[PDB]
Structures are given as C-alpha cells and as structure tokens.
Design a protein around this ligand. Structure first.
Ligand SMILES: [Zn+2]
Ligand SMILES: [Zn+2]
Length: 524
C-alpha cells in the first residue's frame, strides 16, 4: 500500500514482494447447497465447487500457513468510487470499507481465524491488511477457530507441532491432489509449478519437499503418527491451506464440480475449458502436464472431460507413431470413439483409462495386432484394443516375397507383419554397401527395415544359395537370448543371416543388424 507504512511492517522494497494469505471459512453455499471450506476475504467468500461468490456467514475460519511478508488484499470501495478516489485518508477508507473494526491501543483492527489484521493502505484500488498478531499451532499454521474446532485442531497439532513434519506415502507413490498441492505450496508462480510437476516420482517428490520445507518424506506404506498420504482426500481442508498462487490454482481445479448431466463428452470438454480458463491462464497447461507426464490419479469430471474430449486426435497420433504411417484406412477406430464420446458420462472414466493406456501402456505388435504386456489391463481398455485390432485385421493381406508368402498390413504403406514388429521392404543396391558382394547373384537382394537386434558378423564372405522358403512365427530371442552372431547368405534376393547348425535363418536390416522375421529352407 503506501510505501512508508508497508516498509514499517516488512523489509519490502515493492508492494509486489508482499504475499497474499489464504483465508477460508466453513460455510454452506446458497447456489450449490454444499458445506465446504470456501476461500474468502473479510466479507466475500467463493465456493470452490459452484465457483459462486457468497457473503461470509459465522463459521469456523482459518488463515492457513502464514507466508513471509503476509498481506490480505481486498477491493477498496473508497478508491473505486469516483468522488473519493485513489487519494483518500486512512479514516475515509474505514468508513466505506464496510468492514467492522475493533479499536485497540494501536488502532482499528479486524480478527480472522486467530490473526488480528490492520489496514496499511490502498494500492491499485486494492486495500492491503497485515496480520499484526498471528497464532501458531506449528509449522506456521494459524489453526482453526470455531465451535467444534478441537477435533480437527488436534489432528493438525500432531502433524504440525513437530520440528519436521513427516510426509508419509502410504501405498504406492502417485500424483494425486494432496501431493500436487504440497508441491504447489513451494512455487512462486503457476508457470514455475508446471515445470516442476512434470515427470514426478517418489524421489523427486522427496527431494523437492525436503529441500524447500521442514519436512521429512517417508514411503513407509504402514501409516505413522504424522501426515499420511493415501488416496481421495480433498485439498479443501485446513491442512492444505497453503497461501501460494499455484496452490490456489491447484485447489480450485481439483475442487470444481461440473454436473455431467445428459451432455456429451465434447460438450463437457467445452464446458471444462471455460471453467478452467477462468481459474487461470496456465490451468490447461497445468492439467496437461499432470495427466500426460505424471500419471495423475483423479475422479474430477472437469479434468477428465478436458483431456478425454478430442481423443480421436490423440488416438490417431498414438497410432501413427507406432505404425509409422498415415492411419486413415483405420477409420473404424475413430467412429467408435466418436460414438462412445457422444454417450457422455457413461464413457467418461473409460475414456480416462484408455487415455492412460495410450500414454503409459506396454505392448508389442505381433502378426499385425497389438498385444499388451499386462493382465491388469482394465475391461474398458481390452474392449478398445479389440476395436483397434479388428480395424487392423481389415488392413491385413498377403505379400509374397520371392520364395514365400508373408503377412501384410496395407496402411497407406504396405508393411510386413509375419512376426513381432512391422517391417518395410527397403532395398539398397549392392553398389557402395559396406560388405563386399560377389555380384554372382542378381542385385535383387532385399532388406527389411524395422526393429533390429544387435548382431555380430563372424565372416563377411557372402554365400548365395537357393531353394524354397518357409515363413516362421518363432521369435529370434527365443532361439538367441545372447546377441546373434552370423555370416550373411542371400536366398532368391534378400539377405538372411545364418548360423549353420541352427536350421533357422533371420532377415537383415540396413546397417546389417538382424530382424524378428525368421525363415527356414524347404525340407529342413
Ligand atoms: Zn457452492
Ligand atoms: Zn481505500
């Protein structure tokens, strides 16, 4: 506010070095009829569910952890009104502030959740108040003041009066709301928090929380007498009353409630977008960082609706990247997804789970079909994978390399899919190739490009041979756990790596490494 008065409070050079406090009262919201801790100033509170501004009514209140250079900013009626204006006297503020005050020996004060606030001045038509006295139940928390407060107050006390508060992750470590708002408590801007929240894991959560706080972080699954992080606890609780801006965004995002009603998912998505943008210009990028890079667990409708809308584009991207081609022949997959997204809330959590598979799922491509690696694949995901595999099976045909017929996959580029991996049929000419070619044989040698196991090359003598070919389903690692070593052979015009005692041969790649497709010679 006025620089001289603020500097008598804090060793502060500019009003912007002052940190806003988190104030909240437990009260019902007329619009949503729910009783929730609502963020507020001295007179107005906002529902974190409804998002509607309300008038503070008597109830338990708290100021949360007190930050450095703490202030409570409020719109100034006097500064806003045209007649009185930005220049006004301390007592003229108090007349139109419509904030009832108690007169102490130091001057007018106002109390809130165990802090006594004093008015320093207006600045940019906003009043600044500072806490002249502030309780501490430990870790800077101001405690709760109200009628049935001790039950909650005693829990808070046991976690917080410790020199080092103990964070205990009870199960497996996962990004949920409580973890997010604890990390957010350390970030001076929402933008900064975005970068820190990426690729989060127990170690990084441990190093960050411990470096920047009086915390000790334990992953003992068995719970202790301190702050236990299990699952599904709201960030709308005084223990999570951190005052920073990022924490404020995270608390709002995870508290909004959108009624899915009979709306389709792309409708809820458009609704989600506007709700999220009003919270913060960074919130879309914040949720994206949390969902796509740190495996956020939540049941929030807004967060789920924001990311799962679209979905076809995210699915096409996922498909194009692992098939290495355009996926417009796979049209059936996208119609199905459009259809299920139109169902609305019914499909919402299945959309959520499909998305998470696209991001972190573990599979291989075998005989032109996706094969997942885990049997805890959810029922909604098994159904989705079988939608995809049925679309691929429409694109399956037969290519015949000279000597044998091999399973094809016509996807705007023909791929070979007899075995694990998708193989291009790139032919490079013997001209200039590293290994010397007898040129006895036609220069119709074929390579096949794709996933390649490391190879050792005993001798570079090339050995032509002929006879008919057999296509074999067997994987190379099944017969070769160790790196495969061999001397090249060309049968009818493509390099098949060979070891003589084994009756099997494997195809070669540009760069001369071995591949999964494997063949044998007629009659063994
Ligand atoms: Zn409400
Ligand atoms: Zn004023």
């Amino acid at each position: 506010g006025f620089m001289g008065r603020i500097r008598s409070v804090y060793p502060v050079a500019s009003p912007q070095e002052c940190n806003n406090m988190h104030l909240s009262t437990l009260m019902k919201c007329n619009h949503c009829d729910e009783v929730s801790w609502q963020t507020c100033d001295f007179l107005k509170a906002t529902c974190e569910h409804c998002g509607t501004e309300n008038l503070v009514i008597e109830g338990p209140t708290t100021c949360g952890y007190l930050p450095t250079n703490a202030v409570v900013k409020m719109p100034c009626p006097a500064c806003q009104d045209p007649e009185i204006g930005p220049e006004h006297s301390v007592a003229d503020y108090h007349n139109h502030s419509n904030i009832e005050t108690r007169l102490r020996k130091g001057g007018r004060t106002r109390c809130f959740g165990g802090c006594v606030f004093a008015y320093v001045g207006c600045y940019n038509k906003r009043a600044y108040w500072v806490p002249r006295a502030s309780a501490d139940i430990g870790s800077g928390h101001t405690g709760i003041t109200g009628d049935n407060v001790e039950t909650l107050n005693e829990d808070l006390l046991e976690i917080l009066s410790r020199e080092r508060v103990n964070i205990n992750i009870v199960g497996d470590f996962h990004l949920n709301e409580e973890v997010a708002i604890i990390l957010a408590s350390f970030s001076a801007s929402t933008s900064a928090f975005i970068d820190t929240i990426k690729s989060l894991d127990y170690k990084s959560f441990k190093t960050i929380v411990e470096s920047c706080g009086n915390y000790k972080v334990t992953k003992g699954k068995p719970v202790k007498g301190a702050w236990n992080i299990g699952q599904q606890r709201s960030v709308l609780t005084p223990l999570c009353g951190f005052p920073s801006q990022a924490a404020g965004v995270i608390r709002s995002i995870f508290a909004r409630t959108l009624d899915a009603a009979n709306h389709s998912i792309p409708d809820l998505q458009r609704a989600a977008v506007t709700i999220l943008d009003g919270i913060s210009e960074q919130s879309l990028r914040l949720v994206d960082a949390m969902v796509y890079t740190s495996d956020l667990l939540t049941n929030s409708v807004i967060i789920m609706a924001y990311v799962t809308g679209g979905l076809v584009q995210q699915t096409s991207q996922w498909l194009s990247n692992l098939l290495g081609t355009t996926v417009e022949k796979l049209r059936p997959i996208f119609e199905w997804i459009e259809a299920k997204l139109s169902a609305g809330v019914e499909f919402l959590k299945d959309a959520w789970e499909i998305l998470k598979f696209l991001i972190t799922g573990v599979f291989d491509i075998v005989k032109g079909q996706i094969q997942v690696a885990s049997d805890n694949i959810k029922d909604c995901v098994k159904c989705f994978i079988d939608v995809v595999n049925k679309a691929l099976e429409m694109c399956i045909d037969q290519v015949t390399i000279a000597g044998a017929k091999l399973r094809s996959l016509n996807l705007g580029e023909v791929f070979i899919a007899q075995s694990k991996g998708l193989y291009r049929q790139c032919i490079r000419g013997k001209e200039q190739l590293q290994l010397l070619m007898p040129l006895k044989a036609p220069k119709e040698v074929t390579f096949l490009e794709g996933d390649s196991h490391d190879t050792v090359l005993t001798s570079e003598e090339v050995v032509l041979k002929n006879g008919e070919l057999e296509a074999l389903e067997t994987p190379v690692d099944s017969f070769t756990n160790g790196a495969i070593v061999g001397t090249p052979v060309c049968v009818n015009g493509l390099m098949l790596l060979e070891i003589k005692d084994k009756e099997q041969y494997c195809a070669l790649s540009p760069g001369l490494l071995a591949t999964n497709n494997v063949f044998r010679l007629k009659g063994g």
